[PDB]
Design a protein around this ligand. Structure first.
Ligand SMILES: Cc1ccc(O)c(C(=O)OP(=O)(O)OC[C@@H]2O[C@@H](n3cnc4c(N)ncnc43)[C@H](O)[C@@H]2O)c1
Length: 533
């Protein structure tokens, strides 16, 4: 028996192997905090941007008090809770408080708006939603009012800030109570993927496979109690949460430092102030920092490791990381669905500069296939399929998409085009999936096309990626005007999409108007892309 329906467990033969190999240790995810606070209660676990800090024992006890408070509101054992928080201590306490209460966090990004929040809340059948009041000028309480109207199962809204008519997250607090432990083979949390379908898809991650993800990552990246890790990406991004991220830092007893933004003003000051030794960034932020060291006077010498992933870092800026920033670069090609590829910290510099790593687990299985699904000759480019001890066998409550996206023997089709070198290192070559990678942010073309086609001046829409030197890809929306009507310009379409509740990183960079799309009978986006020029 499993606590949640709608997900696809591993076949028993695989689960048996992963337990025998020691990958799946049988511990709930929250126990990484429990055991470290038992072994190192007075070490500094967490530092926020203001300079307030918390020990492991303080973090552990507050998670217990907030778990007991969540139970008093009836949030617990199995309930899905949508979490949308900034990089503050409130997120870290609440993550563990939800786990200890038995609730399943559904982790969303601060940038997600009504369209994304409502879909994941209705898919998950969420009973609670956790928000800031105002973040980067946007009032998330208005969004919570729109979500409660569209999703009647949301009973509670917890607000990190002025709660208005809702519940203040800081008042969710009570004397700790004996709480039962989840089964480690059960879903621990739900992650978001950009996806390639008309709606974002939820990724179930179990206690055993996510703990393995965190533990194995921590080992490969050399994270230990002397690690000071700066969270620059959103805490809810898998890269910054678990690869090894903040969970790896807490598991080994290091210090997590929360950055409010990736800008050099904020990040460089924290690196100097807290002697940060490790952080993870997307390539656009890596390029910004590589430039900014030339006019910023911060002392960054404490930095030992810079992880860069989410999209491909070029070989030329990769070679600048050691001269400009004084640290070791690690390229990371990973996905919320599971498979992580890491360059190793003592790899020759050539492979760190030229490749996106090799798989984390000895039992990550890799296939590279042509259009007919047959394995390519070694070193040829093809589509990456993967299966392993922390890669999902199916999305949450998405049977039709699962039938298209996983092979019969359980390989996940990543939609990435790669070459595998003789050493086993991967080079990312492109993509097969209809999803734009805009500086690390994933834009499902079909989802955005459906939103644009809701505009009354638009009949048909095709969303095509265009190369960009610093973002990798930008978004071009090719429109067929509504019959006898004019299609909107870029700024009017952006305003329509924003009011519809589309996250701002999904707004098209460019609008092109045409009478009809090239057809293969599917829309030929290969030819649209070159018909850009
Ligand atoms: C680093 C990392 C770690 C944990 C994550 O969870 C994520 C994440 O980005 O999660 P996400 O599911 O959103 O994206 C799906 C993925 O994004 C793309 N990608 C990711 N890294 C690279 C790369 N070094 N070079 C080129 N492309 C990349 C692939 O296309 C892939 O499929 C990223």
């Amino acid at each position: 028996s499993h606590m949640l329906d709608g997900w696809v467990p591993w076949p028993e033969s695989f689960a048996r192997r992963y337990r025998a190999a020691g990958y799946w240790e049988g511990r709930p995810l929250d126990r990484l905090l429990r055991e470290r606070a038992a072994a190192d209660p007075d070490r500094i676990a967490l530092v926020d941007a203001a300079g307030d800090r918390w020990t492991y024992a303080e973090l552990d006890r507050h998670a217990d008090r907030q778990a007991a408070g969540l139970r008093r509101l009836g949030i617990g054992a199995g309930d899905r809770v949508v979490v949308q928080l900034p990089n503050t201590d409130a997120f870290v306490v609440l993550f563990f408080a939800l786990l200890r209460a038995g609730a399943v966090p559904v982790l969303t990004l601060p940038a997600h708006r009504e369209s994304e929040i409502v879909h994941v809340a209705e898919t998950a059948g969420a009973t609670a939603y956790v928000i800031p009041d105002v973040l980067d000028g946007f009032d998330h309480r208005a969004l919570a009012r729109a979500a409660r109207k569209a999703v009647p199962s949301i009973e509670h809204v917890l607000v990190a800030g002025e709660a208005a008519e809702f519940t203040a997250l800081a008042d969710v607090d009570a004397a700790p109570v004996p709480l039962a432990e989840p089964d480690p083979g059960d879903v621990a949390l739900l992650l978001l993927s950009g996806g390639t379908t008309g709606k974002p898809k939820l990724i179930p991650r179990t206690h055993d496979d996510y703990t393995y993800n965190v533990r194995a990552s921590a080992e490969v990246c050399g994270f230990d109690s002397d690690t000071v890790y700066l969270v620059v990406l959103p805490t809810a991004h898998n890269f910054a949460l678990a690869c090894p991220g903040l969970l790896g830092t807490l598991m080994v007893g290091g210090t997590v430092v929360l950055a409010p933004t990736p800008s050099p003003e904020d990040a460089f000051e924290l690196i100097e102030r807290e002697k940060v030794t490790a952080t993870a960034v997307v390539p656009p932020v890596a390029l910004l920092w590589l430039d900014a060291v030339e006019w910023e006077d911060a002392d960054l010498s404490s930095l030992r490791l810079l992880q860069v992933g989410g999209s491909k870092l070029g070989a030329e800026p990769a070679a600048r990381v050691r001269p400009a920033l004084g640290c070791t670069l690690q390229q990371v090609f990973g996905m919320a669905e599971g498979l992580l590829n890491y360059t190793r910290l003592d790899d020759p510099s050539d492979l760190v500069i030229q490749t996106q790593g090799r798989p984390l687990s000895p039992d990550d299985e890799i296939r590279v296939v042509d259009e007919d699904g047959r394995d390519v000759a070694p070193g040829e480019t093809g589509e990456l399929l993967t299966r392993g001890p922390y890669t999902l066998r199916g999305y949450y409550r998405a049977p039709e998409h699962n039938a298209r996206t996983f092979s019969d023997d359980g390989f996940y089709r990543t939609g990435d085009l790669v070459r595998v070198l003789p050493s086993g290192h991967l080079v990312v070559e492109g993509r097969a999936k209809d999803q734009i990678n805009r500086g690390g942010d994933k834009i499902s073309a079909e989802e955005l096309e459906n939103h644009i086609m809701a505009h009354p001046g638009v009949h048909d829409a095709a969303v095509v990626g265009m190369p960009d030197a610093t973002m990798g890809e930008r978004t071009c929306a090719c429109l067929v005007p509504r019959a006898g009507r004019s299609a909107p310009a870029q700024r009017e379409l952006a305003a329509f999409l924003t009011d519809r509740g589309v996250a701002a990183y999904k707004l098209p960079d460019r609008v092109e108007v045409m009478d009809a799309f090239p057809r293969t009978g599917k829309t030929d986006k290969k030819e649209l892309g070159r018909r850009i020029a």
